[PDB]
Amino acid sequence: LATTSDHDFSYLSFAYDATDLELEGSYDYVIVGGGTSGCPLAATLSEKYKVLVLERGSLPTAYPNVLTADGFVYNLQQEDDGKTPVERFVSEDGIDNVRGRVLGGTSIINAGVYARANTSIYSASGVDWDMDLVNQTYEWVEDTIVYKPNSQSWQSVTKTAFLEAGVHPNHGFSLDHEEGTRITGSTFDNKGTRHAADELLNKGNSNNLRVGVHASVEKIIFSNAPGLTATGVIYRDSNGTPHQAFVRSKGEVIVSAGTIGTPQLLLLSGVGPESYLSSLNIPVVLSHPYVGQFLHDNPRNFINILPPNPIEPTIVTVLGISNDFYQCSFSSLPFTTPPFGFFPSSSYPLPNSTFAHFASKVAGPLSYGSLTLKSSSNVRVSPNVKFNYYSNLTDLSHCVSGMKKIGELLSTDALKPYKVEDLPGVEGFNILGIPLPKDQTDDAAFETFCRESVASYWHYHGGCLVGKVLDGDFRVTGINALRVVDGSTFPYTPASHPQGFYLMLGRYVGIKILQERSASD
Ligand SMILES: *[C@@H]1O[C@H](CO)[C@@H](O[C@@H]2O[C@H](CO)[C@@H](O[C@@H]3O[C@H](CO)[C@@H](O)[C@H](O[C@@H]4O[C@H](CO)[C@@H](O)[C@H](O)[C@@H]4O)[C@@H]3O)[C@H](O)[C@H]2NC(C)=O)[C@H](O[C@@H]2O[C@@H](C)[C@@H](O)[C@@H](O)[C@@H]2O)[C@H]1NC(C)=O
Ligand SMILES: *[C@@H]1O[C@H](CO)[C@@H](O[C@@H]2O[C@H](CO)[C@@H](O[C@@H]3O[C@H](CO[C@H]4O[C@H](CO)[C@@H](O)[C@H](O)[C@@H]4O)[C@@H](O)[C@H](O)[C@@H]3O)[C@H](O)[C@H]2NC(C)=O)[C@H](O[C@@H]2O[C@@H](C)[C@@H](O)[C@@H](O)[C@@H]2O)[C@H]1NC(C)=O
Ligand SMILES: Cc1cc2nc3c(=O)[nH]c(=O)nc-3n(C[C@H](O)[C@H](O)[C@H](O)COP(=O)(O)OP(=O)(O)OC[C@H]3O[C@@H](n4cnc5c(N)ncnc54)[C@H](O)[C@@H]3O)c2cc1C
Ligand SMILES: *[C@@H]1O[C@H](CO)[C@@H](O[C@H]2O[C@H](CO)[C@@H](O)[C@H](O)[C@H]2NC(C)=O)[C@H](O)[C@H]1NC(C)=O
Ligand SMILES: *[C@@H]1O[C@H](CO)[C@@H](O)[C@H](O)[C@H]1NC(C)=O
Numbered sequence: 001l002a003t004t005s006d007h008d009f010s011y012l013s014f015a016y017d018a019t020d021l022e023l024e025g026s027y028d029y030v031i032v033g034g035g036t037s038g039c040p041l042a043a044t045l046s047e048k049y050k051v052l053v054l055e056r057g058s059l060p061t062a063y064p065n066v067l068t069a070d071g072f073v074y075n076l077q078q079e080d081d082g083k084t085p086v087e088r089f090v091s092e093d094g095i096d097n098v099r100g101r102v103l104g105g106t107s108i109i110n111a112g113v114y115a116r117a118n119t120s121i122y123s124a125s126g127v128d129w130d131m132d133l134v135n136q137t138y139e140w141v142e143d144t145i146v147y148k149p150n151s152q153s154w155q156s157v158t159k160t161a162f163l164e165a166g167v168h169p170n171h172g173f174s175l176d177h178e179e180g181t182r183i184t185g186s187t188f189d190n191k192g193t194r195h196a197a198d199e200l201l202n203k204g205n206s207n208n209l210r211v212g213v214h215a216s217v218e219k220i221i222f223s224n225a226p227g228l229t230a231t232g233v234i235y236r237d238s239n240g241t242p243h244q245a246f247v248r249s250k251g252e253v254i255v256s257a258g259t260i261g262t263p264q265l266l267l268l269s270g271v272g273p274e275s276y277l278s279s280l281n282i283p284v285v286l287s288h289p290y291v292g293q294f295l296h297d298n299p300r301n302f303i304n305i306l307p308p309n310p311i312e313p314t315i316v317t318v319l320g321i322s323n324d325f326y327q328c329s330f331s332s333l334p335f336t337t338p339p340f341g342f343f344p345s346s347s348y349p350l351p352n353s354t355f356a357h358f359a360s361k362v363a364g365p366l367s368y369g370s371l372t373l374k375s376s377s378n379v380r381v382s383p384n385v386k387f388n389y390y391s392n393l394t395d396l397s398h399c400v401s402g403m404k405k406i407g408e409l410l411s412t413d414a415l416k417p418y419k420v421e422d423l424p425g426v427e428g429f430n431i432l433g434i435p436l437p438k439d440q441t442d443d444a445a446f447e448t449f450c451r452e453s454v455a456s457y458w459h460y461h462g463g464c465l466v467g468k469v470l471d472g473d474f475r476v477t478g479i480n481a482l483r484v485v486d487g488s489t490f491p492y493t494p495a496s497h498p499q500g501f502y503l504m505l506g507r508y509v510g511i512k513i514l515q516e517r518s519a520s521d
Helices: 010-014 038-045 069-077 131-145 153-164 197-203 258-268 274-279 393-410 413-418 443-453 499-520
Strands: 015-017 024-032 051-054 086-090 096-100 170-173 180-183 209-213 216-222 230-236 242-255 293-296 299-305 318-321 325-332 355-362 369-372 384-386 482-484
Touching: 010 015, 010 197, 010 209, 024 038, 024 230, 038 051, 038 197, 038 209, 038 499, 096 258, 131 197, 131 499, 153 180, 153 318, 153 325, 153 393, 153 413, 197 499, 216 242, 216 258, 242 258, 242 499, 258 369, 299 393, 299 443, 325 393, 355 393, 393 413, 393 443
Parallel strands: 015 209, 024 051, 024 242, 051 209, 170 180, 242 482
Antiparallel strands: 086 096, 180 318, 216 230, 230 242, 293 369, 299 355, 318 325, 325 355, 369 384
């Protein structure tokens, strides 16, 4: 764990605007996307080799409010002008969502909750994990940007409700994803300063690592067939000028553009379903049927209460973990401008007083959709994505159980003081939005609630799965010098909150690559 301090921007010494980067550069490794996995991956590789990270967004300093906990909602409320750190999008299901567009990636705009992955998920992942390395990597990340949170009144109230509602056992303070209630770590420190993946760049070698911002990577360049090999990438700067970055012998291009960005770049580069690419006149480098397939987004269902007596804003630290759903509560100040993605659509009531958001995330999820291009040539145009929420009925069954548990929390002595009326059961609260069914035994009513009030938990993943597009070493099959390392690689969420796993993944693969190079020397 780290100790409270200012956000470390020492890496700014080797950060350049794409306009200032050479038109044609040569490096050992080129990483597309300076995000959650991308930054630690880049820093790790820079320990011995020349690395170039290309990020489409700005430096965090360009948007000060991404640096504090008090700015979380603010960033989501800001209008998307194409340059802001929060890029807005709407799934084909009709659910509002957002993704990061800034150095540090989505770790720069998230809710800060930090958890280590469920220790039982490594065996069925399709990857043979070096667990000693995994834990060493978690420690490396934690010692830099993870903190033990201060106590917060509302989070403590939530903890009492979870324990009263049977979410057992109590783990006290713990970073591990385990069934029960606990206070976990946060990437926000004790003064409210946000720490993120960009700071992991400081762990790299300042003489071997170079970061390019405002760099839009449009295509991966490949050698002639057979024996296809990625040779570099083409990126464009703010002046519309295209640049090229190539990789040297034994070097590699690694895509860490995220669940949305990675499949998009692969498709635009000619790596994807043959008939799909040909239908758009995109030359096929290699037919890869599953690029953009198996996109998963865990549904978020919730209940907003408006306490008669004001509660204070808090950062999420208390988690109530069940095997099929994960829960927590967020307390916030009122607002007239809605934070995009918080509520599923723009037609939702606004809170004019403080409120508490009780959220429930379905595990998995089992349901999935796909990603397709909206533009066959412009990487700056968001891809179309559909998640097919609740297409798998087991996900729905878990939502029902999860919302019934929320019903239990609302019926605890712990939450009684926050009701406006003495009403029994889950009744008596001033609710903002769709209320829970009164009858806690009416499954059909809960299914309707689940379907009509669903929102995104923003933990979407998949699209370039290990075993479908990648091999156990994260290499894109059929192509040399090309890997994918970010949230697009697995079908199920690693924990209630995935950033910990994705941060770890970046350095983990980085070390595996260095170990491979060491053996090849
Ligand atoms: C919602 O998600 C659930 C959970 O994932 C789906 O249910 C699972 O569906 C799987 C099939 O896609 C089942 O796996 C099969 O199970 C049988 C029985 O054990 C097994 O024989 C199959 O194995 C085959 O043979 C080899 C093994 O000897 C194997 O190497 C082959 O590759 C081949 O698979 C295979 O493992 C799961 O058992 C099942 N889980 C549960 C708990 O039911 C569900 O899928 C639907 O419902 C299923 C019951 C089944 O009818 C399936 O066809 C349906 O699609 C998902 N629902 C939806 C709408 O997709
Ligand atoms: C990689 O890191 C993980 C954690 O992310 C290691 O797993 C942890 O290992 C520690 C040390 O063995 C465990 O701590 C002990 O836990 C027991 C039981 O705690 C549980 O039950 C009590 C109730 O009695 C609850 O209060 C707790 O909250 C918890 O639910 C406790 O009695 C001891 O005093 C220690 O605190 C820890 O539980 C465990 N966490 C998880 C999620 O597994 C992992 O270590 C390996 O696996 C564990 C289970 C042991 O077998 C170790 O010997 C292994 O090394 C580590 N892996 C590696 C390779 O180092
Ligand atoms: C609002 C919100 C709140 C969240 N809250 C939490 C939380 O509290 N705890 C938690 O654990 N998780 C949380 N998450 C999820 C977690 O933050 C993400 O799952 C994780 O950051 C994803 O990491 P990634 O590396 O895959 O992608 P990203 O961090 O998004 O990184 C991909 C990077 O690639 C860049 N990029 C994309 N395309 C291109 C291109 N063509 N050229 C150049 N650069 C490109 C992007 O700008 C971005 O910086 C939240 C997510 C959201 C959106
Ligand atoms: C941790 O990960 C495991 C493995 O993915 C999850 O699944 C286990 O628990 C389920 C619920 O009881 C069982 O039905 C599964 O058979 C079992 N899977 C295996 C192979 O062990 C587990 O639910 C996760 N735990 C939490 C708290 O999320
Ligand atoms: C504000 O709160 C009052 C409660 O007195 C409620 O009647 C009203 O609808 C709310 N207004 C908005 C815009 O949320």
